[PDB]
Amino acid sequence: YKLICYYTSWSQYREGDGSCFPDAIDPFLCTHVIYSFANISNNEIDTWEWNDVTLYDTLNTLKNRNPKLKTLLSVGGWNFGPERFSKIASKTQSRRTFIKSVPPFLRTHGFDGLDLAWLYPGRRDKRHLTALVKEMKAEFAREAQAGTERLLLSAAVSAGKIAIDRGYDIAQISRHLDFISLLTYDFHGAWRQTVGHHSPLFRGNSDASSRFSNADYAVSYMLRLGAPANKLVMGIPTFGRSFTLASSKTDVGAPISGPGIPGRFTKEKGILAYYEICDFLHGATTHRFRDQQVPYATKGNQWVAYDDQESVKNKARYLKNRQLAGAMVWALDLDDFRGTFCGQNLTFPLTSAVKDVLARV
Numbered sequence: 534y535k536l537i538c539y540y541t542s543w544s545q546y547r548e549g550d551g552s553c554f555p556d557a558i559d560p561f562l563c564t565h566v567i568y569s570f571a572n573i574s575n576n577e578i579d580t581w582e583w584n585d586v587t588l589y590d591t592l593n594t595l596k597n598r599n600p601k602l603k604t605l606l607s608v609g610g611w612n613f614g615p616e617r618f619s620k621i622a623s624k625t626q627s628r629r630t631f632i633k634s635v636p637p638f639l640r641t642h643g644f645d646g647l648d649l650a651w652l653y654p655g656r657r658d659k660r661h662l663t664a665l666v667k668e669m670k671a672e673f674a675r676e677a678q679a680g681t682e683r684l685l686l687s688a689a690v691s692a693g694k695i696a697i698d699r700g701y702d703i704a705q706i707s708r709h710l711d712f713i714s715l716l717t718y719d720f721h722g723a724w725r726q727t728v729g730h731h732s733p734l735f736r737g738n739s740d741a742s743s744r745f746s747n748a749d750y751a752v753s754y755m756l757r758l759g760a761p762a763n764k765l766v767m768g769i770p771t772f773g774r775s776f777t778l779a780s781s782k783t784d785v786g787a788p789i790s791g792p793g794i795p796g797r798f799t800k801e802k803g804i805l806a807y808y809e810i811c812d813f814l815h816g817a818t819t820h821r822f823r824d825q826q827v828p829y830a831t832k833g834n835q836w837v838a839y840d841d842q843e844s845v846k847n848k849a850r851y852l853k854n855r856q857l858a859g860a861m862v863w864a865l866d867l868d869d870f871r872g873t874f875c876g877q878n879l880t881f882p883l884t885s886a887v888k889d890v891l892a893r894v
């Protein structure tokens with residue numbers, strides 16, 4: 534069982550305790566840690582924050598306390614134009630230049646692999662996406678000839694039926710990717726105004742349309758398109774999505790006027806870190822969609838959908854019963870990394886819960 538964990542580079546800037554560096558990571562918690570978002574310039578992989586070289590180095594030293602740890606660097610992300618990616622993949626000339634530029638870069642900074650986070654391929658990208666992966670892996674097999682351990686190659690994929698049908702050739706890229714991470718937590722549309730859970734586990738007996746929006750369906754679909762169970766990694770949120778109610782209605786279906794208010798440390802509308810949700814929970818009413826098996830809390834005119842220890846152990850068991858390769862946790866830095874915000878003196882509550890379940894059988 535794999536436990537891929539993402540560490541986001543821009544979490545250093547957060548004020549107070551909110552600040553997180555490679556430093557705070559438990560060497561023995563995850564199996565793969567993915568440093569989040571490198572850039573591309575002149576069709577060549579490159580750093581993003583000025584001190585990426587120092588943090589790169591800082592993270593890669595964890596491999597000194599734990600030999601078996603493996604780290605990878607991710608390319609793209611949400612603040613990286615889709616188009617920008619799409620331009621590089623279409624022109625074989627500019628694509629080969631990018632591919633040729635990765636090995637070196639990783640070997641120098643100490644990573645054991647690359648992670649592609651092209652955030653959403655369009656109908657016109659599917660063919661090139663397949664080209665990019667295919668060729669990139671060929672490059673990695675060829676470079677292992679130099680007598681060093683072959684670099685890994687993976688990818689962050691959407692879990693939206695429509696998104697997959699539109700831009701991914703799952704059967705084709707499944708064979709060159711070392712492992713695939715399903716973004717099973719972006720389900721409730723950024724578009725419409727209705728309270729809903731972004732990462733539901735199950736269909737949920739009460740609501741006909743868009744059953745395609747839950748981890749279970751996303752997973753069953755990928756297996757059908759051709760992805761091997763031994764390459765799928767299911768995504769698990771370590772954050773919550775907030776909304777500002779537009780009425781005293783709190784139950785499934787209630788009106789919304791927009792995202793929720795900012796977090797004191799997170800400072801971003803609509804999102805809250807797990808440690809912020811821990812402080813928010815005080816004096817809030819909790820609820821739990823029994824059909825989907827996922828939380829939600831309300832307080833004042835704020836309605837928050839999130840994941841606790843139990844909702845997370847649940848997804849972990851599911852993951853196991855379908856025999857998937859493992860779990861993926863988005864943001865170690867959104868988890869209670871210090872462990873001084875959520876009751877129990879434990880550190881990394883959620884990611885640990887996933888790990889305990891994974892080490893069972």
Ligand SMILES: *[C@@H]1O[C@H](CO)[C@@H](O[C@H]2O[C@H](CO)[C@@H](O[C@H]3O[C@H](CO)[C@@H](O)[C@H](O)[C@@H]3O)[C@H](O)[C@H]2NC(C)=O)[C@H](O)[C@H]1NC(C)=O
Pocket residue numbers: 572573574575580581
């Ligand atoms: C990831 O890589 C991007 C592509 O290289 C970087 O971008 C830009 O490259 C230049 C420089 O900023 C931009 O054009 C600017 O350059 C000069 C400064 O010499 C300015 O005078 C001019 O006004 C422009 O700002 C381009 O806009 C841009 N290329 C694009 C956007 O297509 C980008 O900085 C980098 N991202 C980060 C955070 O490193």
